[PDB]
Amino acid sequence: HHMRVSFMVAMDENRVIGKDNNLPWRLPSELQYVKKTTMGHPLIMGRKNYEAIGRPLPGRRNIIVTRNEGYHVEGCEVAHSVEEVFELCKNEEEIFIFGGAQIYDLFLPYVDKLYITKIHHAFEGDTFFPEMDMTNWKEVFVEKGLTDEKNPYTYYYHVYEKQQ
Ligand SMILES: NC(=O)c1ccc[n+]([C@@H]2O[C@H](COP(=O)([O-])OP(=O)(O)OC[C@H]3O[C@@H](n4cnc5c(N)ncnc54)[C@H](OP(=O)(O)O)[C@@H]3O)[C@@H](O)[C@H]2O)c1
Numbered sequence: 409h410h411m412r413v414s415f416m417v418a419m420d421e422n423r424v425i426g427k428d429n430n431l432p433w434r435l436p437s438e439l440q441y442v443k444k445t446t447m448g449h450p451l452i453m454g455r456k457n458y459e460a461i462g463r464p465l466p467g468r469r470n471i472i473v474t475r476n477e478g479y480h481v482e483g484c485e486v487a488h489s490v491e492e493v494f495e496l497c498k499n500e501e502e503i504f505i506f507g508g509a510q511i512y513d514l515f516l517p518y519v520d521k522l523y524i525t526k527i528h529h530a531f532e533g534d535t536f537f538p539e540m541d542m543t544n545w546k547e548v549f550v551e552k553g554l555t556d557e558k559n560p561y562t563y564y565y566h567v568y569e570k571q572q
């Protein structure tokens with residue numbers, strides 16, 4: 409495979425990413441960072457994640473991953489395996505694995521770059537971001553997120569790159 413495989417994820421201090429098929433927090437500023445970074449690049453989404461989003465995201469190829477061979481959504485592409493995704497994206501520069509947990513597990517052996525926002529709070533949750541061995545990964549970007557009236561937690565943007 410030729411395209412760069414980037415994970416895009418926000419998690420808490422215990423790796424929680426979801427509660428009851430939704431996001432446990434509201435951070436409009438973190439969401440804006442996500443738009444800025446992913447704009448014009450394909451988003452790879454697990455079926456559940458996609459249905460929780462509820463609509464195609466503009467200016468990006470939306471690719472939904474499902475085992476269901478009769479699944480169709482207007483304005484979205486459908487893939488049924490890692491390889492089908494790699495076929496659909498064979499000419500792309502960078503794709504974003506956009507969640508949730510099952511889809512992160514799926515593409516974990518292949519990930520080249522990690523865009524991870526870390527939120528400094530312990531949420532109640534049921535869905536978790538998988539453990540990663542960071543040997544041969546270097547942090548290439550870190551920045552404190554905007555904490556204000558509308559964004560009520562402390563969080564940092566991190567970006568890691570796999571080496572070689
Ligand atoms: N905080 C964040 O950064 C973030 C990001 C994304 C999602 N989330 C949250 O995480 C939760 C969703 O994560 P999740 O793991 O429950 O769901 P998910 O990974 O988004 O979707 C699960 C679905 O993916 C499909 N799938 C899984 N493995 C597959 C495979 N090997 N081949 C083909 N299709 C496969 C299946 O679809 P079918 O049933 O249709 O066969 C499965 O039902 C939600 O709460 C969401 O809001 C958080």
Ligand SMILES: CCc1nc(N)nc(N)c1C#CCc1cc(-c2ccncc2)ccc1OC
Binds near residue numbers: 438
């Ligand atoms: C915004 C947290 C988030 N942060 C990071 N760093 N990565 C992620 N993968 C997600 C996520 C997610 C899942 C998710 C995304 C959007 C969304 C809407 C419009 N443009 C972009 C995204 C809406 C609802 C939603 O859950 C119902």
